Amino acid sequence: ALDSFTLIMQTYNRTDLLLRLLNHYQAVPSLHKVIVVWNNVGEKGPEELWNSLGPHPIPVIFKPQTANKMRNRLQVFPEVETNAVLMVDDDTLISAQDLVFAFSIWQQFPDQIIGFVPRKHVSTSSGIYSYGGFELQTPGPGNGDQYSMVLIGASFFNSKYLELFQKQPAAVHALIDETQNCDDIAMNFLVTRHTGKPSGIFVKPINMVNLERAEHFLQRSYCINKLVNIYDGMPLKYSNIMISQFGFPYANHK
Amino acid sequence: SALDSFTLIMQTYNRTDLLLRLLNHYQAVPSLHKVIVVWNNVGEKGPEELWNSLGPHPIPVIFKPQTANKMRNRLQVFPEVETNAVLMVDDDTLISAQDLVFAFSIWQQFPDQIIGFVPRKHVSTSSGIYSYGGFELQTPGPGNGDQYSMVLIGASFFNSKYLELFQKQPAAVHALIDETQNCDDIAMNFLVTRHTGKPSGIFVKPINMVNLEKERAEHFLQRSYCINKLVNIYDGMPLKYSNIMISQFGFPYANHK
Ligand SMILES: CC(=O)N[C@H]1[C@@H](OP(=O)(O)OP(=O)(O)OC[C@H]2O[C@@H](n3ccc(=O)[nH]c3=O)[C@H](O)[C@@H]2O)O[C@H](CO)[C@@H](O)[C@@H]1O
Ligand SMILES: CC(=O)N[C@H]1[C@@H](OP(=O)(O)OP(=O)(O)OC[C@H]2O[C@@H](n3ccc(=O)[nH]c3=O)[C@H](O)[C@@H]2O)O[C@H](CO)[C@@H](O)[C@@H]1O
Ligand SMILES: [Mn+2]
Ligand SMILES: [Mn+2]
Known part of the structure; x- marks a missing residue:
C-alpha cells in the first residue's frame, strides 16, 4: 500500500465496458x-x-450498492489502504503511461486533484455563474485560458477527501442527490476551501479514450450557483x- | 509596487549593440x-x-561598472534590487513578453525554485562520476520520457534571496566559477536544491524565445568537470531529477487538446 493508489470505479449498465477496462487497469x-x-x-x-x-495482479472488490x-x-470504503485514489468513469480508458506520470504528479501535490479533464466557471452577471470549458471566453487576467475545476471522473486525489466530503453541510448532500449530478463540482468546492489553492492541476493526457x-x-451551472449560496461564497480559484x-513524447520540450 | 514585480539583471560583455536591442524589448x-x-x-x-x-x-535602468x-x-547583491524576484537573462537571448508574464506567474507560486526555459541534467555512467548534458544523453530516471536536474539561470526567474545566499557559499565555489569563468548556473542549482530539498527548478516550455x-x-567539458568539482566541495550530489x-x-489556443 506504500506509494500505491486505489482505483475506484462506479458502474451502471456498462458491465461489458467495466470488464474491458478492468482488464486494462489491473496491469x-x-x-x-x-x-x-x-x-x-x-x-x-x-x-x-x-x-x-x-x-x-491485484485484488478487485465488488461492493453492491443499495441505490x-x-x-x-465518494463513500469511505474501509478497503482503501492507500493515501491516493484513482477515480475513473466506467467508459474511460487512460493509458498506463498517463496514469504513472499523473500519479507521480499527485505525490508532489497530494492535496490537490490531479486529472485529465479541466473545466471552469465564468460570470457575465454579478454573482451569477455559468459552467463550461474552452468554448467560453477566458475569465482570468490576460491571454490563454483558465480552469477552476478538474473533473473527478479521471483523476488522482487524496483519500482523506472522501471523509471530508461526508462532513460537508447537509444542503450539499441534498443537492447532490437532488440532481444526481454535480458531485465533482462539489468535490472541487470542498478541496479548494480546504487548501486555499486551485482545487486541481491539469495534466494533459497523451492517450486517454472514451469507449x-x-x-x-444546465444542472452544472445551476449547482455552482446553489453551492455558492450554500457556502456563501465562490471559492474556486483559476489556474x-x-x-x-x-x-x-521524445523531444516534446522543443 | 515592488512586490508584484521582478528585476531584470543582465550581464553584458562585448555585446553592447545586442544589449541595447534587448533592452528596447525588455523595458516594455x-x-x-x-x-x-x-x-x-x-x-x-x-x-x-x-x-x-x-x-x-518605462523603468529605471542602472548600469553598474564592474571591476573585473x-x-x-x-550574482552579487545589488542594493538597487527591490523585488523578491530576479529575472536573469544572457545578453544574447530574446524572450517574448508572453513567456515572461507566464513564467513570472509560475515563479510566484514556487518562489523558492528556479523557473526557466532551458532544462539540463547530470548523468552518471560510472559510480561517483557525473557528466553534464541535455536531451542528447539517455534518461537517468527509472525509464520513460526524460529528466532534468537543472534550469540554467541565463533565462530564468529566481528569488533574490539566493544571490545573497550565493555570497555565503564555500570560497571553493567562488574560486571554481572564477577558475573556469563558467558553471555559475550549475552552482546556483546546487545551492538552491541544497536549500529547498526540492528540484532546484521547474521547466517552463517557452513559446517564443530566440538566441x-x-x-x-x-x-x-568544463561543465562536467564542475559538477564533479562541486560534488567534492559539497561532499555529495544534491541535484534532484524532475x-x-x-x-x-x-x-496557444486549444493547446490542451
Ligand atoms: C464530460 C464530463 O463533464 N464528465 C463528467 C460527467 O460524465 P458523464 O456525463 O460522461 O457521465 P457518465 O454517464 O459517464 O457517468 C459517470 C460515472 O457515473 C456512473 N453512473 C452514471 C449514471 C447513473 O445513473 N449511475 C452511475 O453510477 C457511471 O457508471 C460512471 O462511473 O459527469 C460525471 C458526474 O459529475 C463525472 O464523473 C464526469 O467527470
Ligand atoms: C545553453 C547554455 O549552456 N547556456 C549557458 C552558457 O551560455 P553561453 O555559452 O551562451 O554564454 P554567453 O557567451 O552567452 O554568456 C552568458 C552571459 O555571460 C556574459 N559574459 C560572457 C563571457 C565573458 O567573458 N563575460 C561575461 O560577462 C555575457 O555577456 C552573457 O550575459 O553559459 C553561461 C555562463 O555559464 C550561462 O549563463 C548559460 O546558462
Ligand atoms: Mn461518460
Ligand atoms: Mn549565449
Whole structure:
C-alpha cells in the first residue's frame, strides 16, 4: 500500500465496458487495489466470471450498492489502504503511461486533484455563474485560458477527501442527490476551501479514450450557483498551469 | 509596487549593440520593476548617456561598472534590487513578453525554485562520476520520457534571496566559477536544491524565445568537470531529477487538446 493508489470505479449498465477496462487497469504499475462501486441495484456482479479468468495482479472488490447514487463512489470504503485514489468513469480508458506520470504528479501535490479533464466557471452577471470549458471566453487576467475545476471522473486525489466530503453541510448532500449530478463540482468546492489553492492541476493526457440528456449541462451551472449560496461564497480559484511529461513524447520540450 | 514585480539583471560583455536591442524589448515587459545592467567591459564607457538621450523609458535602468570581467558579477547583491524576484537573462537571448508574464506567474507560486526555459541534467555512467548534458544523453530516471536536474539561470526567474545566499557559499565555489569563468548556473542549482530539498527548478516550455548570438571546445567539458568539482566541495550530489514541463493552458489556443 506504500506509494500505491486505489482505483475506484462506479458502474451502471456498462458491465461489458467495466470488464474491458478492468482488464486494462489491473496491469497498471503502482495499482494496489480496485473497488468497483456496483450501482446496478438488484443485479449479480461479474465477480464470478472475473475470478474464473484469474489470476489477477491485484485484488478487485465488488461492493453492491443499495441505490443508484452518483455519490456512492465518494463513500469511505474501509478497503482503501492507500493515501491516493484513482477515480475513473466506467467508459474511460487512460493509458498506463498517463496514469504513472499523473500519479507521480499527485505525490508532489497530494492535496490537490490531479486529472485529465479541466473545466471552469465564468460570470457575465454579478454573482451569477455559468459552467463550461474552452468554448467560453477566458475569465482570468490576460491571454490563454483558465480552469477552476478538474473533473473527478479521471483523476488522482487524496483519500482523506472522501471523509471530508461526508462532513460537508447537509444542503450539499441534498443537492447532490437532488440532481444526481454535480458531485465533482462539489468535490472541487470542498478541496479548494480546504487548501486555499486551485482545487486541481491539469495534466494533459497523451492517450486517454472514451469507449462508447439535454438539461445535464444546465444542472452544472445551476449547482455552482446553489453551492455558492450554500457556502456563501465562490471559492474556486483559476489556474492556467498545464503539465506534460518532459521528454514524453521524445523531444516534446522543443 | 515592488512586490508584484521582478528585476531584470543582465550581464553584458562585448555585446553592447545586442544589449541595447534587448533592452528596447525588455523595458516594455509587464511587471518589470527595474533593470540592472552588469557592465563587464572593464575600461570601456557605458551606453548610459545614449540610453538617457533616447528616453523616456518605462523603468529605471542602472548600469553598474564592474571591476573585473567575472561571470559571477551578476550574482552579487545589488542594493538597487527591490523585488523578491530576479529575472536573469544572457545578453544574447530574446524572450517574448508572453513567456515572461507566464513564467513570472509560475515563479510566484514556487518562489523558492528556479523557473526557466532551458532544462539540463547530470548523468552518471560510472559510480561517483557525473557528466553534464541535455536531451542528447539517455534518461537517468527509472525509464520513460526524460529528466532534468537543472534550469540554467541565463533565462530564468529566481528569488533574490539566493544571490545573497550565493555570497555565503564555500570560497571553493567562488574560486571554481572564477577558475573556469563558467558553471555559475550549475552552482546556483546546487545551492538552491541544497536549500529547498526540492528540484532546484521547474521547466517552463517557452513559446517564443530566440538566441541572437549571431546578430570554446572546453566550455562543454568544463561543465562536467564542475559538477564533479562541486560534488567534492559539497561532499555529495544534491541535484534532484524532475520531469515536469509546464505550458500555459489555452496558450496557444486549444493547446490542451
Ligand atoms: C464530460 C464530463 O463533464 N464528465 C463528467 C460527467 O460524465 P458523464 O456525463 O460522461 O457521465 P457518465 O454517464 O459517464 O457517468 C459517470 C460515472 O457515473 C456512473 N453512473 C452514471 C449514471 C447513473 O445513473 N449511475 C452511475 O453510477 C457511471 O457508471 C460512471 O462511473 O459527469 C460525471 C458526474 O459529475 C463525472 O464523473 C464526469 O467527470
Ligand atoms: C545553453 C547554455 O549552456 N547556456 C549557458 C552558457 O551560455 P553561453 O555559452 O551562451 O554564454 P554567453 O557567451 O552567452 O554568456 C552568458 C552571459 O555571460 C556574459 N559574459 C560572457 C563571457 C565573458 O567573458 N563575460 C561575461 O560577462 C555575457 O555577456 C552573457 O550575459 O553559459 C553561461 C555562463 O555559464 C550561462 O549563463 C548559460 O546558462
Ligand atoms: Mn461518460
Ligand atoms: Mn549565449
